C-alpha cells in the first residue's frame, strides 16, 4: 500500500509561495481569524502576522 505525490509540482509550489506570495503588498494579504496584531502597521508583528 503506497501513496503518490506530484514531487516536482510541490517543489514548484513551495518556491512560488515563500518567494513570490509571501512578499505581496499589504492590500492583497489578510490577517487570519482570531489573532491580535499590533496597531503599528510598520512594526514586525503586523508584517509577520498577515497571510
Amino acid at each position: 500500500p503506497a501513496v503518490e505525490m506530484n514531487l516536482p509540482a510541490n517543489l514548484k509550489r513551495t518556491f512560488l509561495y515563500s518567494n513570490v506570495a509571501m512578499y505581496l503588498p499589504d492590500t492583497y494579504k489578510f490577517t487570519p481569524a482570531n489573532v491580535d496584531l499590533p496597531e503599528n502597521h510598520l512594526s514586525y508583528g503586523y508584517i509577520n502576522g498577515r497571510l
Partner: protein, 367 residues
C-alpha cells in the same frame, strides 16, 4: 484634470508631522478588532453587506450596532458578542439588522446535548438591562441562540425590559433561552424553523405574542434542572404569557429532530408543550394553532387549588394515531380544562369529558 502646478524641491528639512487619523467617523471595517471600537463610541455602524468574523467580543458599556445587512460568522468554543453589564447603566443596547451564522452547515441534529455544546450561542447578556434584538437571522447553532442570564437582584426591581422581535431562527438546537430571574420582557414574531426547542424557559413573566414554530420538536420546555440556567437559577419560574402563536408539525409531518434531549440530570421525551415543575404555575394559553403538536402536562402547583391549566381558543387537530395528542398525569385530571377549542379528532390522555367544552377529540387513559 492634469495638475500642472509648479513645485520647488524639498530642502532636506525634518518634515513636519502629518497624520491621517479619524478615518472611521463611527464605522467598523472588516478585519478590525471590535473591542477597541465598542469602547470608544455609542453607536457603531457596520459596512453594508460585509462579511465579518467575531469571537468572544466583550461588551461592557451599552452600545447600538446598526448592522446594515452585515454577516457575522464565527469559529471556536466561545460565544459571539458577550454582553456583560453592571446595575448602573442609563443607556440601552440595540442589536439590529445582522445575520449571525454558526460553525455549522445543516447542523448535526443527531448529536446529543452535552456540556461541550453549551457555550455555542451568539448573544449572551449577563446582567445588561434593556437590550433589543430586532430583525436578525440566526442559523445553525449547536447550543442556544440567545441566553439572557440575570444575577440576584433585590427590591422588586423587575425592570430589565428586553425585546426580541422579527427574528428568523433556522437549525438552532435551542432558540431563545433565558436564565432565572430574567423577568418581564417580550419575545414575539420570531419565525422559528427546524429547531429542537424554541424556548428553554427558566425565567417567568415573559410575553410571547405571535411567534411561528414550523417543523420544530419542542416549543415550550420547562422542567427541573434544565440547561441554560446561569447564576441565580430556577427561581420564581414559568409565569409568562403565550398568546396567538403557531406550533404546527411538532410530532408528525416534517419534523427532523429526535425526541430525547439529555438534560444534565436525566433524559426526557420532548413534546410540543413539555411542562414538569411542582413549584411553578402555568402560562396563559390563548389563540395558539397546533397541527400534530403534542402536549405533556406533567406537574404544576395545584397543591391547595392554586393553579388550573386552561386551554382557550386553540386548535388541536391530530388525527393519525397519537400524533398531536395531549398527555396529562392521572393525578392532574381535575385541573386541566379545555374551554373553547377546535380539533379534528385528537387523543386526550387522562382528561375528563365534562372538563372540555365543546366535546371534541378522543378520550383515552395512559396509566
Amino acid at each position: 484634470v492634469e495638475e500642472l502646478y509648479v513645485i520647488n524641491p524639498i530642502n532636506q528639512w525634518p518634515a513636519p508631522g502629518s497624520f491621517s487619523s479619524q478615518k472611521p467617523p463611527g464605522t467598523l471595517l472588516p478585519g478590525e478588532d471590535p473591542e477597541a471600537v465598542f469602547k470608544q463610541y455609542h453607536v457603531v455602524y457596520l459596512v453594508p453587506g460585509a462579511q465579518y468574523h467575531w469571537k468572544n467580543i466583550l461588551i461592557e458599556k451599552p452600545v447600538w450596532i446598526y448592522g446594515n445587512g452585515a454577516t457575522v460568522r464565527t469559529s471556536g468554543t466561545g460565544p459571539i458578542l458577550r454582553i456583560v453589564g453592571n446595575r448602573t447603566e442609563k443607556r440601552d443596547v440595540r442589536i439590529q439588522d445582522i445575520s449571525f451564522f454558526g460553525e455549522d452547515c445543516t447542523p448535526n441534529r443527531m448529536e446529543p446535548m452535552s456540556e461541550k455544546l453549551v457555550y455555542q450561542m451568539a448573544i449572551w447578556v449577563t446582567d445588561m438591562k434593556r437590550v433589543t434584538i430586532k430583525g436578525c437571522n440566526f442559523t445553525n447553532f449547536a447550543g442556544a441562540a440567545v441566553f439572557f442570564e440575570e444575577t440576584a437582584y433585590n427590591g422588586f426591581f423587575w425592570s430589565m425590559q428586553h425585546l426580541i422581535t422579527e427574528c428568523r431562527f433556522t437549525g438552532c438546537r435551542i432558540g431563545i433561552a433565558n436564565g432565572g430571574r430574567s423577568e418581564y420582557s417580550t419575545a414575539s414574531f420570531n419565525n422559528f424553523f427546524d429547531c429542537q426547542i424554541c424556548f428553554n424557559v427558566v425565567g417567568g413573566n415573559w410575553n410571547r405574542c405571535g411567534n411561528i414554530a414550523a417543523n420544530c420538536r419542542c416549543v415550550y420546555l420547562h422542567t427541573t434542572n434544565m440547561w441554560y440556567e446561569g447564576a441565580g437559577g430556577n427561581f420564581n419560574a414559568a409565569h409568562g404569557s403565550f398568546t396567538g402563536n403557531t406550533m404546527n408539525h411538532c410530532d408528525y409531518g416534517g419534523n427532523l429532530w429526535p425526541t430525547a434531549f439529555q438534560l444534565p440530570d436525566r433524559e426526557i421525551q420532548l413534546a410540543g408543550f413539555y411542562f414538569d415543575n411542582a413549584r411553578a404555575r402555568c402560562p396563559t394559553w390563548t389563540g395558539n394553532t397546533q397541527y400534530y403538536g403534542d402536549m405533556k402536562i406533567l406537574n404544576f402547583n395545584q397543591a391547595n387549588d392554586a393553579a388550573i391549566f386552561v386551554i382557550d381558543g386553540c386548535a388541536l387537530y391530530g388525527q393519525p394515531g397519537d400524533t398531536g395528542s395531549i398527555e396529562t398525569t392521572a393525578a392532574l385530571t381535575d385541573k386541566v380544562f379545555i374551554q373553547g377549542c377546535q380539533g379534528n379528532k385528537v387523543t386526550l390522555f387522562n382528561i375528563k369529558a365534562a372538563n372540555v367544552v365543546p366535546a371534541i377529540g378522543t378520550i383515552k387513559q395512559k396509566p
